[PDB]
Ligand binder design. Structure first.
Ligand SMILES: [Mg+2]
Ligand SMILES: [Mg+2]
Ligand SMILES: [Mg+2]
Ligand SMILES: [Mg+2]
Ligand SMILES: [Mg+2]
Ligand SMILES: [Mg+2]
Ligand SMILES: [Mg+2]
Ligand SMILES: [Mg+2]
Ligand SMILES: [Mg+2]
Ligand SMILES: [Mg+2]
Ligand SMILES: [Mg+2]
Ligand SMILES: [Mg+2]
Ligand SMILES: [Mg+2]
Ligand SMILES: [Mg+2]
Ligand SMILES: [Mg+2]
Ligand SMILES: [Mg+2]
Ligand SMILES: [Mg+2]
Ligand SMILES: [Mg+2]
Ligand SMILES: [Mg+2]
Ligand SMILES: [Mg+2]
Ligand SMILES: [Mg+2]
Ligand SMILES: [Mg+2]
Ligand SMILES: [Mg+2]
Ligand SMILES: [Mg+2]
Ligand SMILES: [Mg+2]
Ligand SMILES: [Mg+2]
Ligand SMILES: [Mg+2]
Ligand SMILES: [Mg+2]
Ligand SMILES: [Mg+2]
Ligand SMILES: [Mg+2]
Ligand SMILES: [Mg+2]
Ligand SMILES: [Mg+2]
Ligand SMILES: [Mg+2]
Ligand SMILES: [Mg+2]
Ligand SMILES: [Mg+2]
Ligand SMILES: [Mg+2]
Ligand SMILES: [Mg+2]
Ligand SMILES: [Mg+2]
Ligand SMILES: [Mg+2]
Ligand SMILES: [Mg+2]
Ligand SMILES: [Mg+2]
Ligand SMILES: [Mg+2]
Ligand SMILES: [Mg+2]
Ligand SMILES: [Mg+2]
Ligand SMILES: [Mg+2]
Ligand SMILES: [Mg+2]
Ligand SMILES: [Mg+2]
Ligand SMILES: [Mg+2]
Ligand SMILES: [Mg+2]
Ligand SMILES: [Mg+2]
Ligand SMILES: [Mg+2]
Ligand SMILES: [Mg+2]
Ligand SMILES: [Mg+2]
Ligand SMILES: [Mg+2]
Ligand SMILES: [Mg+2]
Ligand SMILES: [Mg+2]
Ligand SMILES: [Mg+2]
Ligand SMILES: [Mg+2]
Ligand SMILES: [Mg+2]
Ligand SMILES: [Mg+2]
Ligand SMILES: [Mg+2]
Ligand SMILES: [Mg+2]
Ligand SMILES: [Mg+2]
Ligand SMILES: [Mg+2]
Ligand SMILES: [Mg+2]
Ligand SMILES: [Mg+2]
Ligand SMILES: [Mg+2]
Ligand SMILES: [Mg+2]
Ligand SMILES: [Mg+2]
Ligand SMILES: [Mg+2]
Ligand SMILES: [Mg+2]
Ligand SMILES: [Mg+2]
Ligand SMILES: [Mg+2]
Ligand SMILES: [Mg+2]
Ligand SMILES: [Mg+2]
Ligand SMILES: [Mg+2]
Ligand SMILES: [Mg+2]
Ligand SMILES: [Mg+2]
Ligand SMILES: [Mg+2]
Ligand SMILES: [Mg+2]
Ligand SMILES: [Mg+2]
Ligand SMILES: [Mg+2]
Ligand SMILES: [Mg+2]
Ligand SMILES: [Mg+2]
Ligand SMILES: [Mg+2]
Ligand SMILES: [Mg+2]
Ligand SMILES: [Mg+2]
Ligand SMILES: [Mg+2]
Ligand SMILES: [Mg+2]
Ligand SMILES: [Mg+2]
Ligand SMILES: [Mg+2]
Ligand SMILES: [Mg+2]
Ligand SMILES: [Zn+2]
Ligand SMILES: [Zn+2]
Lengths: 181, 53, 141, 154, 69, 110, 123
RNA sequence: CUGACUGGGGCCUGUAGAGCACUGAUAGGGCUAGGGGGCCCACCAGCCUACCAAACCCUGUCAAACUCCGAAGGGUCCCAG
RNA sequence: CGCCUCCUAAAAGGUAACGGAGGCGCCCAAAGGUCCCCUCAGGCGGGACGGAAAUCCGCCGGAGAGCGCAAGGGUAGAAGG
RNA sequence: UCCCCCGUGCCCAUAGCGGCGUGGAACCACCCGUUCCCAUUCCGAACACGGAAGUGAAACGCGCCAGCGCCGAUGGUACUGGGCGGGCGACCGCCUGGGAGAGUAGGUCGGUGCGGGGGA
């Protein structure tokens, strides 16, 4: 493995504050980050193009990890959707690549959101996971307005081992997630 | 069988003898079928090519 | 009038009619009930007639429970036809009803109001009946 | 509460012969015994119409025993509307489930209760169309536990 | 990790408008940004920007009490 | 509710047991590898081997081949020659493969 | 995404580029530049990275812009609608607010015409 | 001597009856996603339903093409008369 | 008017009527062989555009999904991907 | 021979859901790594390999609890093979042999074969 500031922060700062905040008797009881799953549910590229490429190439720059295509489970007439059409990109970020992306997501990406007033405290999973949604992909530093062609957003799933929202919100705020309320 | 789902013979490409009968959907599969099949005359497996029945 | 809203199949073969009623033999809701003594296909019209009779006697008062439902399609060929050429069309619905069935119950009413209302109802029915009162035998079931 | 009923043991008499003889085939059981019995039909009728599965009936078996029972089942002949068999549950100290009546200061006439045979009450009192409450808000005298989910409307 | 399908993450220097520097990894060796988390007015504590108002409208519409007491 | 692990293990075991052969079943822990040749008609293990019993250590693969030869050695003693390999939940690879290669090397027929 | 959250267009002079920011007209563009020593004629493409942040810092700190300005504009309309003053009813029903007559034009405020049928003559 | 029929033993079955777990039907009540009903609101809410509206819960039922169950029998093989 | 599925059909098989209901006269070059791997529907909570329903995450979930098309049988310890 | 663990069967929920308690020496797991073999329609999550600092948190193993699930008598009944009656019928009754389903009492938080590691 290697040294990322957020990772070293999780052990040095966030783990002891968690234990003294919650009283974990076992060192594996204390919440951990598990994975970061990024979902671009496009559907614009259903048939109108294989723009999935220029959007996976930019997901590949943001995460360092090549996305994988997702295909339509069922057919849906109202959606103009045949079963099996390529309608999105998903990439599972774990371990150090998870830290590096989370580190930049907090340090540069979320602040670059305009009219940003903090992450929604209500969006916790009910079971200790978090999800947020972005409307632009140029919020990230690896993406420039010259390199873009169309604004695409995403869903970000951060999974933790915390059993509760209460533990997970402490885990993510201590790491540096600005929550609105 | 149908007008688009046609019957066809498989001809051993080495001794030219038709050895098998089968079908295909010529719209879905326009190219001539090529399949390895055992030729009783050549007593060995060989490339077989579709011809008109 | 009663009838199923939907049905898997439009036409049923004709019943048999053996045996005491399968269930619904004990007073379940009201104080007094009306009991079938003989088997029959009770039509929806018979039910609706016994029911209105008990309403116009309760002068909109009391409670009326109808514990039989006409779910069995009843078929009849058009007049003067010959046999065959398939089953006749559905012209009505009956509820299979066998001895021991509580068909109707009443409550919210005096013993004299209920006994008379149930008596009038039985005159609308193509079978003999018998009026019962909620006993402990009922409440033990 | 409470009542008494003569009860005699049977072995190989046909239930049809007993019923024809104006008697009521029956059984007696708990965790420790199981006996085939019969009560006299008319005698049982006047007790059960009052005692009715809520109240204790003490069986006076000819062998001197006075076993306290609760009626737990009455199968009827569906044609004639006449009882044709009785299950007498021999009460002993272990906690049982039974139906207790409800008298109000009206869906449920009674309620299922887990209780010891010592603590068997006569009443469970209620309070003051169309309105209604649930068994959650209920009295519960000493020794009795609501033997349902309180989602029951009363 | 599969070979030949991913862009190589390398040490990366991120530069903000507040003279801030971040040492992270990325696909670009050096990135400049106009804003980071060390200076976002939300992040920088309260940092009430142009608007310290609230509001003071409207009951602070004084000036004046010049109706005769 | 079955996991993919249990579904896999049933899937390969069902197919082996249909052939009626004695089953060379292999279990692989993070430390040790265990083998036992099994008669499914009698429900009896006929012969076994393992790094835990042989008290071996070192390279897990190189040790896996060793128990293979050790299991074969004792197997030929009791008459067992033909056998069907049971990779259970494991890919035919690495440690399991080495144990498989070992048993053949010692003379088991599969 | 440079200043504030909008990329002011390159190839144009810096004074006109800054106007492409909600909350900066020509006169405010005149200020920020003069108060920071950047030639108002300089093309955006040809500004120092030192001049970017010097222009940016003042602009973003002196007056409130893009989103906040819209939120404070929205808050005042909302306030007028909430109390029920006459201007508040105008912003609700979507009619003009500053004394203009509505018998004829008001189209900017009313939108496309909704032609109805009229009264008839006699033959 | 193998037969009809009969004794014993094993296997096969989905009817009678019953049941409601599945597919549908279904009476009373409670809790209730979509509303109508609507004191009404559209500045963004609401709010109340002695009415219909899935699911669930309690009471109560119906079915050739329903079955969580399930006989008596019936079939077939072996041994015996 | 031939063929398939269910019922009628009376718990082996078979069993009729101008009895109750549907389907077929194709299709697939993989929708075939084998090896390796994977496990659904739906409910609820979470997530830009995004809706009842696209794609993503968590939890529950034995099969109520899927198996080209009727029905029945079968089936995730796969026949489904 | 007995206890614990590991592997593998058999009975096919009296074996399950849930709640709780408990175990790391050994064994198992997670775990430490991703050089190597091999692997991801992306991901060392999985599969796989090399390891042994840590933890039984997860999983698993063992216990305790009857809320749910599951099992479930006895007795009585329905029905019925064979034999007889009754009713205009719809349908009913008797003898003899057989005998459910529902429900009541009640039971169940598994039992067992083979091999291996450990223990007394
Ligand atoms: Mg600690
Ligand atoms: Mg990396
Ligand atoms: Mg919440
Ligand atoms: Mg950027
Ligand atoms: Mg979690
Ligand atoms: Mg073909
Ligand atoms: Mg020849
Ligand atoms: Mg041809
Ligand atoms: Mg008929
Ligand atoms: Mg019937
Ligand atoms: Mg009639
Ligand atoms: Mg008819
Ligand atoms: Mg007819
Ligand atoms: Mg006809
Ligand atoms: Mg009846
Ligand atoms: Mg009459
Ligand atoms: Mg009377
Ligand atoms: Mg009576
Ligand atoms: Mg009942
Ligand atoms: Mg006495
Ligand atoms: Mg009497
Ligand atoms: Mg009870
Ligand atoms: Mg004054
Ligand atoms: Mg060695
Ligand atoms: Mg090994
Ligand atoms: Mg194995
Ligand atoms: Mg402007
Ligand atoms: Mg005007
Ligand atoms: Mg003979
Ligand atoms: Mg014979
Ligand atoms: Mg016979
Ligand atoms: Mg029947
Ligand atoms: Mg049902
Ligand atoms: Mg029935
Ligand atoms: Mg049936
Ligand atoms: Mg059973
Ligand atoms: Mg038969
Ligand atoms: Mg026989
Ligand atoms: Mg036999
Ligand atoms: Mg003989
Ligand atoms: Mg013919
Ligand atoms: Mg034909
Ligand atoms: Mg048959
Ligand atoms: Mg059939
Ligand atoms: Mg035959
Ligand atoms: Mg004939
Ligand atoms: Mg046709
Ligand atoms: Mg081909
Ligand atoms: Mg096929
Ligand atoms: Mg294949
Ligand atoms: Mg949601
Ligand atoms: Mg969506
Ligand atoms: Mg389909
Ligand atoms: Mg079809
Ligand atoms: Mg199916
Ligand atoms: Mg010994
Ligand atoms: Mg084990
Ligand atoms: Mg065992
Ligand atoms: Mg519990
Ligand atoms: Mg512990
Ligand atoms: Mg445990
Ligand atoms: Mg340990
Ligand atoms: Mg230790
Ligand atoms: Mg490598
Ligand atoms: Mg544990
Ligand atoms: Mg229980
Ligand atoms: Mg059973
Ligand atoms: Mg039972
Ligand atoms: Mg019995
Ligand atoms: Mg009878
Ligand atoms: Mg008989
Ligand atoms: Mg019969
Ligand atoms: Mg016979
Ligand atoms: Mg007879
Ligand atoms: Mg006669
Ligand atoms: Mg007549
Ligand atoms: Mg009879
Ligand atoms: Mg009879
Ligand atoms: Mg009999
Ligand atoms: Mg008998
Ligand atoms: Mg039973
Ligand atoms: Mg009993
Ligand atoms: Mg009990
Ligand atoms: Mg019990
Ligand atoms: Mg126990
Ligand atoms: Mg249990
Ligand atoms: Mg035990
Ligand atoms: Mg076991
Ligand atoms: Mg065995
Ligand atoms: Mg042992
Ligand atoms: Mg020993
Ligand atoms: Mg031992
Ligand atoms: Zn040839
Ligand atoms: Zn900064």
């Amino acid at each position: 493995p290697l040294d990322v500031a957020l990772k070293r922060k999780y052990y040095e700062e966030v783990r002891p504050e968690l234990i003294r905040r919650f009283g974990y008797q076992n060192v594996w009881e204390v919440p951990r980050l598990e994975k970061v799953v990024i979902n671009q549910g496009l559907g614009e590229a259903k048939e109108d193009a294989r723009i999935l490429e220029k959007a996976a190439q930019e997901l590949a720059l943001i995460t360092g990890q090549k996305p994988a295509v997702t295909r339509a489970k069922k057919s849906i007439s109202n959606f103009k959707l045949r079963k099996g059409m390529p309608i999105g990109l998903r990439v599972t970020l774990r371990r150090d690549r998870m830290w590096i992306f989370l580190e930049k997501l907090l340090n540069v990406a979320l602040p670059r959101i305009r009219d940003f007033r903090g992450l929604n405290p209500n969006s916790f999973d009910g079971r200790g996971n978090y999800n947020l949604g972005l409307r632009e992909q140029l919020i990230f530093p690896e993406i420039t307005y010259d390199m873009v062609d169309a604004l695409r957003g995403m869903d970000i799933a951060v999974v933790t081992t915390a059993e509760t929202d209460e533990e997970a919100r402490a885990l993510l705020e201590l790491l540096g997630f600005p929550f609105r309320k | 069988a149908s007008e688009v789902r046609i019957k066809l013979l498989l001809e051993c490409t080495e001794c030219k003898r038709r050895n098998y009968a089968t079908e295909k959907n010529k719209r879905n599969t326009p190219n001539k079928l090529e399949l390895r099949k055992y030729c009783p005359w050549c007593r060995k497996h060989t490339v077989h090519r579709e011809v008109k029945i | 009038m009663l009838m199923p809203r939907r049905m898997k199949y439009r036409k049923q073969q004709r019943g048999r009619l053996k045996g005491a009623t399968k269930g619904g033999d004990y007073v379940a809701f009201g104080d007094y009930g009306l009991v079938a003594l003989e088997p029959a296909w009770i039509t929806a019209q018979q039910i609706e007639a016994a029911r209105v009779a008990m309403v116009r006697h309760f002068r909109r008062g009391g409670k009326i429970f109808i514990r039989i439902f006409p779910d069995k399609p009843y078929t009849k060929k058009p007049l003067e036809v010959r046999m065959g050429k398939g089953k006749g069309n559905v012209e009505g619905y009956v509820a299979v009803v066998k001895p021991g069935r509580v068909m109707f119950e009443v409550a919210g009413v005096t013993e004299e109001q209920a006994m008379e209302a149930l008596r009038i109802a039985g005159h609308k029915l193509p079978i003999k009946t018998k009026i019962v009162r909620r006993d402990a035998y009922d409440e033990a079931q | 509460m409470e009542y008494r009923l003569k009860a005699y043991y049977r072995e190989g008499e046909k239930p049809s012969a007993l019923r024809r003889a104006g008697k009521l085939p029956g059984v007696m059981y708990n965790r420790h015994l199981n006996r085939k019995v019969y009560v006299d039909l008319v005698e049982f009728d006047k007790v059960f119409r009052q005692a009715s599965i809520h109240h204790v009936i003490v069986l006076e078996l000819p062998d001197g025993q006075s076993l306290p029972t609760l009626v737990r089942q009455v199968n009827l002949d569906k044609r004639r509307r006449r009882p044709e068999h009785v299950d007498f549950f021999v009460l002993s100290d272990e906690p049982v489930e039974m139906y207790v009546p409800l008298r109000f200061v009206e869906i449920h006439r009674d309620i299922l209760v887990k209780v010891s045979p010592r603590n068997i009450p006569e009443f469970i009192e209620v309070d003051v169309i169309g309105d209604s409450l649930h068994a959650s808000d209920l009295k519960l005298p000493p020794g009795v536990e609501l033997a349902v989910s309180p989602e029951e409307t009363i | 990790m599969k070979e030949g399908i991913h862009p190589k993450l390398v040490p990366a220097r991120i530069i903000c408008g507040c003279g801030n520097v971040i040492e992270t990894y990325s696909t670009k060796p050096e990135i400049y940004v106009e804003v980071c988390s060390k200076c976002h007015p939300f992040y920088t504590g309260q940092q009430r920007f142009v608007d310290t108002e609230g509001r003071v409208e409207r009951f602070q519409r004084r000036y004046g009490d010049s109706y005769r007491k | 509710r079955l996991t993919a692990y249990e579904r896999r293990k049933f899937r390969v075991r069902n197919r082996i047991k249909r052939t009626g052969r004695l089953r060379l079943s292999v279990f692989r822990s993070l430390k040790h590898i265990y083998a036992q040749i099994i008669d499914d008609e009698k429900g009896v293990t006929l012969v076994s081997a393992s790094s835990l019993a042989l008290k071996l250590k070192g390279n897990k693969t190189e040790v896996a081949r060793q128990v293979g030869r050790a299991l074969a050695e004792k197997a030929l003693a009791l008459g067992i020659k033909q056998v069907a390999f049971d990779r259970g939940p494991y890919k035919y690879h690495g440690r399991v493969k080495a144990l498989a290669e070992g048993a053949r090397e010692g003379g088991l027929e599969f | 995404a440079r200043i504030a959250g909008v990329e002011i267009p390159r190839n144009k002079r810096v004074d006109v580029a800054l106007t492409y920011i909600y909350g900066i007209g020509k006169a405010r563009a005149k200020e920020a530049l003069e108060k920071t020593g950047i030639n108002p004629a300089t093309r955006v493409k040809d500004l120092t990275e030192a001049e970017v942040v010097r222009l940016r810092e003042y602009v973003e700190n002196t007056w409130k812009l893009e989103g906040e300005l819209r939120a404070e504009v929205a808050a005042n309309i909302k306030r007028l609608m909430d109390i029920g003053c006459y201007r508040g009813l105008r912003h609700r029903r979507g009619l003009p607010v500053r004394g203009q007559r509505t018998r004829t034009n008001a189209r900017t405020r009313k939108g496309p015409r909704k032609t109805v049928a009229g009264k008839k003559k006699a033959p």
